[PDB]
Design an enzyme around this catalytic site. Structure first.
Site, short mmCIF file in Angstrom:
data_model
loop_
_atom_site.label_atom_id
_atom_site.label_comp_id
_atom_site.label_asym_id
_atom_site.label_seq_id
_atom_site.Cartn_x
_atom_site.Cartn_y
_atom_site.Cartn_z
N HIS B 97 54.85 18.99 14.13
CA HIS B 97 56.24 18.96 14.61
C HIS B 97 56.55 17.67 15.35
O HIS B 97 56.16 17.52 16.52
CB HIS B 97 56.52 20.12 15.54
CG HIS B 97 56.86 21.38 14.84
ND1 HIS B 97 55.92 22.28 14.41
CD2 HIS B 97 58.07 21.91 14.51
CE1 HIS B 97 56.52 23.32 13.85
NE2 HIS B 97 57.83 23.12 13.90
N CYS B 104 61.24 25.44 15.08
CA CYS B 104 62.00 24.59 14.17
C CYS B 104 61.29 24.49 12.83
O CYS B 104 60.06 24.32 12.76
CB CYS B 104 62.20 23.19 14.78
SG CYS B 104 63.11 22.08 13.70
#
Ligand SMILES: [Mg+2]
Ligand code: NA
Ligand SMILES: [Zn+2]
Ligand SMILES: [Zn+2]
Ligand SMILES: [Zn+2]
Ligand SMILES: [Zn+2]
Lengths: 162, 162
Positions: B97, B104
DNA sequence: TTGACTCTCTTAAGAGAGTCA
DNA sequence: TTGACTCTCTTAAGAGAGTCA
């Protein structure tokens, strides 16, 4: 053990024993294209390791002393910090190798900090490459660099924005 | 085995579904005292999560599709990279990420790299603070900074030199 | 075929404790 | 008392696979 005197005696005995470990010179990147020299006091690869020391894992050791007829045992790198708080911001304090050399027990190469702070030094640019650690790094972290990313961020369609 | 076309179809259905997740605007440090904005496509906190998605851990999810009567399942962030090599330098590739926001699933916020490279981004100074990642960081890592070290290197006697 | 749960595992920085002699 | 072994656990970035309707 319990008394401050007993704890100081533990630290002093540990320092005396670790002080007789072989001293191995390591030349290390500092960042900024500069190189430095560290002197690590390395626990032996196999038994015997030294008075009070025993291996509990491939690169894990413990220090043991008998005080008031009771055995007291600590992780081998934690002994310098027995008079320090054992937590910070609700996170466990850990012995952190500034020299990135597990066998080393030189207390001048150790600090006492959260596991996150500890881990993060692996990627630090080093004391001559921009280290911002308040307790300064002794060398550039071994994992500092551009990385080897196989694929970057990408989409096939038009549903996403950065 | 799934064909290239079938894998592309899996990626396309994943993008269609993730693109409908709530899009949350986050203001983030970029390094160098600058602030930027990231738009995260966040999987819901509880079921239902979206077509094909299910939670296997507190912050772990999987994507599942059944093709020609065979069930296929992938880690929920790995789907953008199904046409890429899955290891590099003898290390398994992981979804990483860039936005440091586990929920997300925006593929513009993900890259595909070793676990060490992945972890190291937590301490990166960021794209405007000195990032050297070849696949550049989108923001300063959440753990960048001076740290909170409780005790630094020290000795009681004179047995050691740095 | 699909959803919503369940379980354990990997890594590399770190730990605690028991069994024998 | 001291030495030399054995075992599993913690964390926070990440994983694969089973059960039931
Ligand atoms: Mg990450
Ligand atoms: Na360390
Ligand atoms: Zn050292
Ligand atoms: Zn540093
Ligand atoms: Zn994001
Ligand atoms: Zn970076």
């Amino acid at each position: 053990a319990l008394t401050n005197a007993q704890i100081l005696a533990v630290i002093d005995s540990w320092e005396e024993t670790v002080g007789q470990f072989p001293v191995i010179t390591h030349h290390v990147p500092l960042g900024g294209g500069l190189q430095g020299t560290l002197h690590c006091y390395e626990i032996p690869l196999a038994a015997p390791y030294g008075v009070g020391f025993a291996k509990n894992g491939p690169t894990r050791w413990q220090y043991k002393r008998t005080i008031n007829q009771v055995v007291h045992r600590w992780g081998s790198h934690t002994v310098p910090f027995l008079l320090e708080p054992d937590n910070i911001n609700g996170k466990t304090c850990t012995a952190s190798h500034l020299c990135h050399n597990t066998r080393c027990h030189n207390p001048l190469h150790l600090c006492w900090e959260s596991l996150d702070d500890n881990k993060g030094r692996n990627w630090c640019p080093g004391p001559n490459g921009g280290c911002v650690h308040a307790v300064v790094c002794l060398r550039q972290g071994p994992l500092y660099g551009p990385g080897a990313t196989v694929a970057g961020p990408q989409q096939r369609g038009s549903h996403f924005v950065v």
